[PDB]
Subunit: 329 residues, 4 copies
Amino acid sequence: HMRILFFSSQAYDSESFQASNHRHGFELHFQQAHLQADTAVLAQGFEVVCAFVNDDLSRPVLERLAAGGTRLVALRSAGYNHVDLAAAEALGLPVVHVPAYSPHAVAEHAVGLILTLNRRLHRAYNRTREGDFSLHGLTGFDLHGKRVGVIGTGQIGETFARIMAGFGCELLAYDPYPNPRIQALGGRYLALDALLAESDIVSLHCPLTADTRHLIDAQRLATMKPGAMLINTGRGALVNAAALIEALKSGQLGYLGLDVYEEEADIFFEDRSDQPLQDDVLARLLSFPNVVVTAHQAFLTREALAAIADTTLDNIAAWQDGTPRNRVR
Amino acid sequence: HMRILFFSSQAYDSESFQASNHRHGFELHFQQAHLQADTAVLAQGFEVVCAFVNDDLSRPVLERLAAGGTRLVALRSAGYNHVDLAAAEALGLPVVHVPAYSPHAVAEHAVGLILTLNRRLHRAYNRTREGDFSLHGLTGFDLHGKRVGVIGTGQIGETFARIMAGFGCELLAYDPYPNPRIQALGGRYLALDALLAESDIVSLHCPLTADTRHLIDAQRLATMKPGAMLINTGRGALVNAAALIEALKSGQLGYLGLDVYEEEADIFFEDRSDQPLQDDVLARLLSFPNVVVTAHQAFLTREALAAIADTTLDNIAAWQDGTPRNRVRA
Amino acid sequence: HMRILFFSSQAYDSESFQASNHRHGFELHFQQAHLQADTAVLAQGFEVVCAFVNDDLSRPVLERLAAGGTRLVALRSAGYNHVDLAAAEALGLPVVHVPAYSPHAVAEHAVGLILTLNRRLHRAYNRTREGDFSLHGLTGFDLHGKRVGVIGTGQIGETFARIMAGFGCELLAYDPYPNPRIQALGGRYLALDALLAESDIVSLHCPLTADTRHLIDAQRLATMKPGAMLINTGRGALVNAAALIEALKSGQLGYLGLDVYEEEADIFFEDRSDQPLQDDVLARLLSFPNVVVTAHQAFLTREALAAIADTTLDNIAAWQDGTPRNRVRA
Amino acid sequence: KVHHHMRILFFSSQAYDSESFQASNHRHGFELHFQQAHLQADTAVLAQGFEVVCAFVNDDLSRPVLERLAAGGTRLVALRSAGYNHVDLAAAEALGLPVVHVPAYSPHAVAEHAVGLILTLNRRLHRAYNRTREGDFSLHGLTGFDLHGKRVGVIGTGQIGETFARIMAGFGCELLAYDPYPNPRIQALGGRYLALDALLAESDIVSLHCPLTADTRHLIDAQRLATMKPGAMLINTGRGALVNAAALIEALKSGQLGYLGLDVYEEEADIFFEDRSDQPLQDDVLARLLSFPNVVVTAHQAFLTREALAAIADTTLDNIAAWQDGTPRNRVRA
Ligand SMILES: NC(=O)C1=CN([C@@H]2O[C@H](COP(=O)(O)OP(=O)(O)OC[C@H]3O[C@@H](n4cnc5c(N)ncnc54)[C@H](O)[C@@H]3O)[C@@H](O)[C@H]2O)C=CC1
Ligand SMILES: NC(=O)C1=CN([C@@H]2O[C@H](COP(=O)(O)OP(=O)(O)OC[C@H]3O[C@@H](n4cnc5c(N)ncnc54)[C@H](O)[C@@H]3O)[C@@H](O)[C@H]2O)C=CC1
Ligand SMILES: NC(=O)C1=CN([C@@H]2O[C@H](COP(=O)(O)OP(=O)(O)OC[C@H]3O[C@@H](n4cnc5c(N)ncnc54)[C@H](O)[C@@H]3O)[C@@H](O)[C@H]2O)C=CC1
Ligand SMILES: NC(=O)C1=CN([C@@H]2O[C@H](COP(=O)(O)OP(=O)(O)OC[C@H]3O[C@@H](n4cnc5c(N)ncnc54)[C@H](O)[C@@H]3O)[C@@H](O)[C@H]2O)C=CC1
């Protein structure tokens, strides 16, 4: 019955969704192109559109989709800052998402970035691979005993905090809604500025909203402990990357791990190595020995993908039965 | 200025030891060469020799050292499988070590290898560096819920077990002397073969002895779960690397992280990139997308190095006060 | 509106062929799969099949193609060792090729491999990229004055010779046939074993036939000048790659540049980086600092591709008109 | 009755320097001291008491350095290099400090390297190597072009530029040339002299082989890049300051410049010849140049061949012996 058009489709998306669809028999169409004003016409006549985090679901796109017959927007993601939710509501277009496919996948990836940066595992790998077994510049630091500041102690942030507590770190936390689980781990809540000044490692797990946009700016970087590590597996626009470059150059910021980037939408998820990279700031970030960028793969585990696909297909079935689930606000 | 000769010296060694020697004023000499039968003559007239894990302290070397006037052997390491302890004892040469400079350094490195392999971070890095933001082949797996088998639950193995429990892993353990802290974490002890057959990830933290040599061989790899991950931050000779190659090629072994290698002694710690690598087995291990080798750097953190230098210099001061500590015995 | 089925099609092939002005109203179909016994059925009802150098055109494949209605085999290549020519002839299936799309493209690539190996440019690139501006191991040698031995002085060999003469190299040559252009360049013909013993650099440009198969074997490697450079942009089976590995490890062979490899057929032209590489010998060749392998891209220039497409489309038109051109004969 | 004292301090010394110079010194027995640091105002004191100082291309031999060296007893400055833009020759002369150099150790070593950069860029050999090393045997993005038939413009047809031109003519390239002082050997070769702007507009590949002087400084600037053929290749094995690298970045990003090979960089002096991989790179412009797939940078190694090194060492030790006997050779003058 039901027909679903997926934008920004990759092979991992079709594999996982085709496996999960043995339980549903929806008719699945995978389109590679990003959703934007000039591709929305591809969804003409599709009742359901399945979008990912760098699809453009601003007002003009939503208007096109609604006018073309689309009646549900299914986000195969937890995040939803790319959707104009007020406009969806005005158009009577429900928006559904997958709020907790695997908080562990994302938290673990953040911990992986930390360790790769700390022990210079990315540099080591390239050395041993060519028969360079020298260790200059690879000396790391013990995680045990360090102060780890978590900004945003929700599903992912809390899971990240628990892992880091298991390394014997001292947890510092900031959230407008503190939670008791963090305290039970030994964490202590404090104000943002104090967290920044006291943390050896900071990790961002708050959503992107008007209040978190450029939360990490020049001013705030200058507050941080010299040589600190910053991890961003949240959203690119949580940080001002031009300011990160200056702090990296001065040594003020010791390490940076990114799984997201502010201008990632038209570059991530494809191989653009054959052409010059246009984004000056990203190119410069990539040049540093103490920066690691992964291309928005913190979600990318077998279990995460299976849960995304199962929950998304269930969301759609629930909507089709008139009892929708996992709606976004 | 008591005189200490350091073999296999690297810049990080002379830097850390020099900083720590502000509190002692020993006279420190750093030799780059490895200690072996051929190089032992360099220690003539040195009362104290400081060696590392790839120096050869077998009987013939210890005999030369003793004949040349050396009276103490200070290991700037926790491990001591490179020392013939019976022969040291017969010669009246005490051997001292640093047993617990930082169990966390080594455990954390093992967990780093696990995550790099899992999320293919070493491959991702190289891709994004050149503007390849594609994700094919990089899908990993949640650590939460997996079974992690720890072989050797001592200072490092236990610290590793604790970290992995914090990711929500199910801990399985094998040690001739089980310890209660592991059970308090939720770990369950079992026999070696059962641990191998049931684990998704296996990590080696037992010392190298005649009983652990080639513990992971062809037969034991075949009993492991298909696609499992094996981590070796112990010693090279705990595994048979030729058998690892065959299991990697078949897919039987899904991942391998090594910080040690059986024939590392004359290879590691130096940049040999300008010449062909002679060792066929290491070259082949290095060829795989699901193998990561680090060059015996699990011990290499600021805190580990400072503790190694401080404890080693203190060990030597204690010896020279007639109250030796951190001795290793036959 | 004759239809053409292309096997082993890559994006650069379909772009190339579609952008030609020489379509002659043909209908072009591009299949990615390699031609072999179990894919030949895809050509059922196609009058013309276009194949590349790693397609299987042995007798059983040719029999299927003829039984399925294919009447012409068009090689988008110069080389034809992959074709059983006697069997094609017995089936009345003409085979056409492109013998001289661009001898310069291929010769220039060989020269590129030479310079890369000499100046260690592949190593330098990765160093500078990460801010390593050190030069240890990168010292090269002046080409000017060196002896360059060319095995096979045909279209590509003589173009290569000509380029190497322009660097002021001394040219040595071996071919069953004299070529007066080689003498005009200053080249001297000599016997194979003498060429091998006297040359600083050797480059292979003979076709693969039963007489050139494994021309470079253990015994002939041992005759070469110690530390010499060997370049192979001919065909993989001209050399014995297991013997190349031993000579590289001993230092007897100083450098190796390959654009071709004996078991390339099912490996080259794809990205196989996500899985272990099965071929031990290729994995080991890839491990060396003084080996460069490119994946059969010597033909791969803008001008070469355009000529291959134009000449191949013309060859097919000329066959259709009953005046065939560029036939290869048993 | 037959021959059977002299102390030399080398700045910016590397292992390949002490090895080559020690081999050549079997013929002399001078006393050789190798210092790693770069020569500049605050390291000049290390040459106190040394009659001879041997410097390389990134040592600072401006007036204030030369004044310290002279005051400290140094009597000869021996450049282990062909180039000399780093020396204030008028100041050396005013101080009575002769400066000697090695003008032609191996013009082939440098020309050949430039050709290597061309071919690596053209066939993407650097990209292919990293692919095949990890089992990626795909060829997308690696299509090159035939050199045969292309136009190659040589700016500066001296020893190196002429050797380069001859090599490129052997590939069947058409040679275009610009030099304020044309020479007949290039024409005899089939090369055609023309004005700079016309060379820039007509060339598929341009290679710089002029010295750095006040007239060649930023010779390749934004305006001259905009004159070039779209998608052209530029090669710089001359000096860093011959080009404006910020403008090269904009032309690379637009596609106006198709390829860039550098063996030299304007701010190289305090970074090249060292492994600086363990720290951030401070220079924004170099970091960005390094990011591109169609840029290759080698760290000033065009001179670096066995034969070049042996000639530099032999000629440099000979220049010092000749000076010591009062009959100096290979002097450079203001
Ligand atoms: N890189 C990746 O692949 C993925 C990234 N993400 C990002 O992670 C974010 C977090 O996801 P969850 O933890 O699941 O969400 P959640 O809703 O469980 O938790 C978010 C937390 O952030 C806090 N928060 C809100 N505003 C804040 C502010 N101004 N300052 C500090 N904290 C604030 C909330 O109070 C809440 O505790 C998502 O918004 C998404 O952008 C999510 C999934 C994958
Ligand atoms: N990669 C690196 O840089 C470093 C490696 N190591 C290695 O790790 C090893 C372990 O270190 P620690 O935890 O400090 O030692 P430990 O002595 O504290 O603990 C070792 C554990 O191994 C167990 N064990 C002994 N024999 C066994 C057997 N046959 N089978 C299974 N388990 C057995 C012991 O009962 C003990 O619980 C060292 O012996 C050394 O080789 C140590 C430091 C650094
Ligand atoms: N890497 C690549 O992409 C390419 C490789 N090739 C290979 O290069 C080969 C050469 O092609 P061309 O120069 O065009 O061919 P060609 O036919 O013009 O010249 C071949 C020469 O090799 C000589 N030769 C034949 N048998 C010989 C033997 N037994 N020993 C020594 N020399 C012998 C012939 O006398 C002739 O002079 C092709 O057969 C092909 O395999 C060709 C094009 C591209
Ligand atoms: N990358 C490297 O490792 C090396 C670089 N070089 C550089 O290459 C340069 C060339 O050296 P050689 O060819 O031996 O010098 P050379 O003196 O023989 O020739 C230089 C040529 O440039 C020409 N020229 C002078 N002023 C010019 C101007 N304003 N515009 C255009 N052309 C002009 C000259 O007339 C002469 O024909 C050296 O000055 C040096 O900076 C030299 C050696 C090694």
